[PDB]
Amino acid sequence: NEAAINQAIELHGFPQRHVKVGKEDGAPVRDNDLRRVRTIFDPRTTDANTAYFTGQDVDVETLEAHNFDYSAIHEMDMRNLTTALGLPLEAGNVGADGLGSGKPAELRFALLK
């Protein structure tokens, strides 16, 4: 699960840029052309205040980061692992609502003792 999250964050946790070249139903672009386009919009040489100038027939589309609740996956992973190992979930750096006060707290510490 940790490996799956680590990979998924790289693929989907970061936005990515998709340059679409040429008009819909227009003249077809070839990859020797895309080499020259890639050389312009290169993230390797782009900066925070860069501006782009084009004809109407070029689009800079965005793969928006397809957000997912990896935090809850972490809490589930930690819940399973700690409770399998017989530890309180708090030892795994994970909290819970309501259970942080009174004898509803003390019971886990009693079980540990």
Partner: protein, 140 residues
């Protein structure tokens, strides 16, 4: 033909013997039942030379590392030649009428762009992904 139409570029076509050109012309003339017999050799030669140059410049190289000419380069160049020959003559007839006898050839609207406008073009168009752009590249 001995040198095939896919084996020759514009400069090569100019280097061929008259017979080698004529064999290729004879192959192109198979694509119409009329053989375009009322159009001169020079015009058929120019159409072929043009089709060869146009293939090599507009229908060459790659997109996404697929070849942009997917089909048989022989028949592509022949169909592109036949497209050119037909356009040297007003294009396709939607109808022909003579001494009372008449016919109509179901061509229809036929789109708007070059290869759409004649039957040989419409055949050649399947060889080159229907003029679509499947092109893709990435950062490295």
């Amino acid at each position: 033909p001995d040198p095939s139409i896919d084996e020759v570029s514009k400069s090569d076509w100019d280097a061929l013997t008259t017979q080698e050109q004529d064999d290729i012309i004879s192959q192109v003339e198979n694509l119409s039942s009329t053989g375009w017999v009322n159009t001169s050799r020079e015009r058929k030669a120019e159409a072929i030379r043009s089709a060869i140059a146009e293939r090599d410049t507009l229908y060459s190289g790659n997109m996404s590392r697929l070849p942009t000419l997917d089909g048989d380069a022989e028949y592509f160049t022949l169909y592109l030649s036949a497209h050119k020959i037909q356009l040297f003559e007003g294009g396709e007839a939607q109808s022909e009428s003579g001494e009372g006898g008449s016919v109509s050839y179901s061509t229809g609207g036929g789109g708007e762009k070059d290869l759409q406008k004649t039957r040989y073009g419409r055949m050649a168009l399947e060889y080159v992904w229907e003029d679509n752009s499947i092109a893709a590249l990435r950062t490295y």
